[PDB]
Structures are given as structure tokens and as C-alpha cells.
Amino acid sequence: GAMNSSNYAELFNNDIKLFVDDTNVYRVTVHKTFEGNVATKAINGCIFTLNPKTGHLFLKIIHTSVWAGQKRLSQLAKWKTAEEVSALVRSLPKEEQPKQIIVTRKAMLDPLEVHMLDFPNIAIRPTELRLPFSAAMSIDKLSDVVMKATEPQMVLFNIYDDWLDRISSYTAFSRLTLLLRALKTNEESAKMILLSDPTITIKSYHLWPSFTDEQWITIESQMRDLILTEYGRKYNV
């Protein structure tokens, strides 16, 4: 059934699984028209499909042309997500196909189940975890590839950089979710933490800075402070 704090280590076992987050698929700016009405303008989006054990990220870029002439876009976006995830699964060799797909929002369950009828043995699961994957577009290299896209495109990344050489998947996921939670709660501050220091480069082939083990401890502490702080500035505590 649902994925929560109790069965949390299941994410790091040897059964292939993917999280799917659809938050950033349909993105708009809201603006005034010449007549003083309100209209939306779509901007490019992305499906965030992540293997939490290996860090492999399948970033399917959703170009605004997919919305042209379509109605009820927020509903369509869920079905388009499910269509693209199904197409990704079919494209993978059998031994790489997931045994479970965990959707971050329960409204993805029926669209994905329907698109995966041909795969009765792949479990489609919700989660009670409040995961911060919406903040993926605060990672500069991911935002850049999405905004520059002129056509539908899939781009592959490892969201853990080389961290798995030194830490376990559990610890790598914990770091990722801490970074993304910080970026979601106060993007400007989080990005200042990550990059204020101009002596730590981000490698061309990486997403995050090249911190030593000790520097990661300081970084992680600084992100925890930020999250608690903002939780202060928010609730006045």
C-alpha cells in the first residue's frame, strides 16, 4: 500500500523502484490582459522520475507546445505524466524496469494505473511522505535545461553526483531531501549557503558543489538551521 515513515528503508533495498513527481509538469505565469482580464502563459515543465537507490533521474522535459489547443490542462498534465512514465518503462530493458512506482501525489494513481495496465506486476503506490521534489527546479542545472528546451526531450542525471562512492543510499537520499526542503522553504538563503563560499566549484558533470565530508556536515547543519529558522519566521516561535 502506501509508503510512509514506517517502511522507509524499503526505498534502499534491491527491488528497482521509481518516485514520480508531477508538480512541475504544468507550469504557468498568471498575468493581466489588455482588457484587464486574467490569463495564463505556460512555461516549460518537467516530470521528475527518480530511482532513490542509485540517484538516476529521468528528467522528461515538457515543452509548452504539448498544451497547444488543449483544454483542462491540469487534468491533462496528470495523464501526460502517466503516458510519459509508461513510455519510459517500455523503453527500458526488462531487467531495468521498476517493480514499484511511487507517486508523490495521490491524483497520479488512476492515470498511472490506467497507463500501466500492460504491466500488472508493477505496483503503483502512493506515499504519506511530504517529499520536497517540487524544488527540483531550484537546482540551477535542471532549471536551465528545462527552460532552454525547444522540443520535448529526456535528459538523464545522477542527482547524487558521486556521493555514493562515500555514503550509502539512505544517507544520500536524506541529504537530497534536506537540500530540497531548504530550497523549498527559503531558496535565496539555501542557495547562499550552498554557494556563498567561492573556493568550492561545482564540477561540469555534477549538480551540487564538491564538498568534502567535513564541509557536508557544516552544510547540512546550516540547512537544518535554515529550515528551523524559517519555521520560526513563519509561526513566530
Binding site: 491533462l76 495523464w79 502517466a82 503516458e83 488512476d110 492515470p111 490506467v114 495496465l117 500492460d118
Partner: protein, 300 residues
Amino acid sequence: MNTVPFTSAPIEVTIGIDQYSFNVKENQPFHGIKDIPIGHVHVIHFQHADNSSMRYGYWFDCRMGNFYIQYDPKDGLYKMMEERDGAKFENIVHNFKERQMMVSYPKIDEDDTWYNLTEFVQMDKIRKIVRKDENQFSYVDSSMTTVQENELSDPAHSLNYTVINFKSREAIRPGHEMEDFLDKSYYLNTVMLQGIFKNSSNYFGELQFAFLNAMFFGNYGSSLQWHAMIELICSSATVPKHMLDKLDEILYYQIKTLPEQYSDILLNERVWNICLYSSFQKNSLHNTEKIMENKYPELL
């Protein structure tokens, strides 16, 4: 007007005949039911006084044979049987009528209720859902499971209702996933009406047969089937106008006949609220919506 003669009534029992019912005391001189209208299927059903568990009964059509009830003390139930000797049977019956040992099917002349509940129900079609090929009548009880229930255990004792499953390859054309799930017209009109059922008379008949088994026996799988068949029509944007008009009449008489005190268990809140207020056909069931709103506004 036909008759169903009883050898006797050895155990106290409430006997239903269609929408009517009456109590018979242990060893009371009861010898059956006369004046049964020809032209419709009928159901004769039983609930024992000592064990209200297991309502059970028999669907039959007197045009197909001479049928009588005799209690079996070994299996502990009232059994329907066919007598093949037409003359012995006419004789036992005329005798019981002369002794006035029978209840009369108590139909009011103005009243079309049973016709309206059984318009597309016939004995031959009933046997395609409930199987015992050696008898012309069909036994149903409260506990019998449906073929679909058995997929999610005795096959011979099952109601073969056509499996309806909205998240199934049968319901969903490859490449039309969103379209077919949000608008079930292709599943309704092509798969079910043109392919399996063959016409709306057959679809309406299974829908009606499902309701009556739910109402008379508390058969849970039949209730599921009735609601699934309603939901499949209501969730289709393209339905022939005559089917919508007939469905409104069918459901109206079903809601009208339902015991007020069984609405809680026999009516699915989600399906009815979806069908009456959210579906493509939210505005096409005027008679059903009016009776539901005036009789069961709590559910909604």
C-alpha cells in the same frame, strides 16, 4: 393465472412472492400460492423464523412447467421441483383450491410495479447468469458470490454476471487511456452493448436482475453489479436517448420499491452522488433524481 402448490409447511417461515410476503406458522395448513400472473418471471423466496440467516429463493416462469415447493428435512430448506405429470398436478392443485388452502397473489389492478421491475427479465436469460441446466427454475441465496468476486470459491454455485471493470484492458483502448477512462462510451456502446450483451434490452435485464437479487436476498455481489451497470451508463458522454429515458424509469421503480430501512446498505453513496450530480448524465435522470431527493436526501 397459475399456481405454485406446496406439499406442506413444516417449519415456520416468512415466504415472499415477488414484492409481497406473508408469515406461515410451523405446521400451518398452507398449500401454496394461486393467481400468479402469467407473462412475467417471478421469484418465490424464504426466510426461516429460527435462522434469518440465508434468505434464499427461486426464479421461475409458470409458462415453462408446473412447479411445486416441498420442504426437505435433510437439507433443511424449501425446495422447488417440477412435476412432469400434468394431470396429477392439476388434480392436487384443484383439491387444494377447493379446500381454500392457498394464498392469492395479491395484485392490485392499477399496480404495474412488478412489470416495471422485470421489464427485461426472462427465465431463459436468467439461466445464463445462474446455472443448474437440469432445472427450469433458478436458485439464488444471500451468500452466493459472483464470477468477479471469485477473481479477487465454488464455480457451480456462482452468479455469472458480466465482469465490468473500469481499470481493465477491456475498458481502455491503447492510446485512448485518458479518453476512455474519463468517458466510458466506447466501453458501454462497443464492448458491452454491441459486443457482449448484443442490445440494451439485455443490458437493462442484467441491471434489473442484479437489483432484485440485492433487494430480495441481500446479495452483496448483485448490489455491486447493479451499481456498476448504472455507473457505466452515467459515466458515458454518448448514450442513446431511448436508453437514458428507459434507465430513468427503471431506476425510479427500483428506488420506489426499496424498503426505506434497507437504503443504508443497498445504496452506494459515491455512485449515486456521482451519477446524479457529477456525471455526464447528471441531468438526464429527472424522475430518479426527484424520488431520490425526496426519499433519501440523507445519502446525498
